[PDB]
Design a binder for this molecule. Sequence first.
Ligand SMILES: Cc1[nH]c(/C=C2\C(=O)Nc3ccc(S(=O)(=O)Cc4c(Cl)cccc4Cl)cc32)c(C)c1C(=O)N1CCC[C@H]1CN1CCCC1
Length: 286
Amino acid sequence: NPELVQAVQHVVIGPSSLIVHFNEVIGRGHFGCVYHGTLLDNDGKKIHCAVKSLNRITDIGEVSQFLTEGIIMKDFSHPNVLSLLGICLRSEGSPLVVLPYMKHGDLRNFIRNETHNPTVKDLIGFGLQVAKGMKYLASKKFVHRDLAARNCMLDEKFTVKVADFGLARDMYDKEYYSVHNKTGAKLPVKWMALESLQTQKFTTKSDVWSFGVLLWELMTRGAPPYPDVNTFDITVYLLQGRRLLQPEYCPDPLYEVMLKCWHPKAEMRPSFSELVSRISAIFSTF
Ligand SMILES: Cc1[nH]c(/C=C2\C(=O)Nc3ccc(S(=O)(=O)Cc4c(Cl)cccc4Cl)cc32)c(C)c1C(=O)N1CCC[C@H]1CN1CCCC1
């Protein structure tokens, strides 16, 4: 499609700019592996990067859909939102999606790591970062649909980046995805707002619900949500008004914030602007 090739042209990367280390796999998704790479910016310097292969995709139509949906990310720019470096086009072999390198990986493993032992304050700071990244996306009217600790990365300066959207979205670990929902597709049902499970629709408000689960993940340092609720039962569980319990080391006012995030009435849940304020307030008390 022309329109699409137009926009991709904006972010095209010439192969001689890009070195991929195919011996260096940093993740496997349904579309293909992600590799270590190094990119050369025009005015000099080596940029370490993550290179996503789309070689698994067979249908050209699947690729058009994917670029189409994902390309708008090039318009985003915010220190708490993952950026697109560019797209490399080639002869044999699919386009490579070029993304920033995240030295410290995903937030969930980072905080589960026992030698890291992040403090409650560190944990709340990470949460505040994610809040600010979501505030930006909502203002662009972009709905994430899969916010969670496993989908936020940390760079070498320990800046948190909301990720796994757009050209970076793929199934990377299916443990916490389930087809037991109305669409029949693998969805993150234990992060989904009640109404999305019922109506199959996603909004910024259900992003807020997910951010609420993400917070609980931080304060438990990466414990799995609802470990004793079957994926068959998560809707009924929530209808009954039951919710994730307060973590041992979660401050009380932060648990309030979580609970506001899981209000059954979608419009009764705070905005990310609200969240950034409230959570910022709580962070300062530390
Ligand atoms: C070095 C590294 N990088 C990453 C992830 C990303 C990166 O470097 N750039 C990215 C750009 C986008 C995204 S994403 O979130 O949009 C999609 C994605 C990808 Cl590409 C790969 C894995 C998971 C996900 Cl959700 C992730 C990374 C990860 C998960 C790791 C990474 O892998 N790290 C870092 C801490 C120590 C180590 C822990 N690993 C456990 C098994 C081998 C080592």
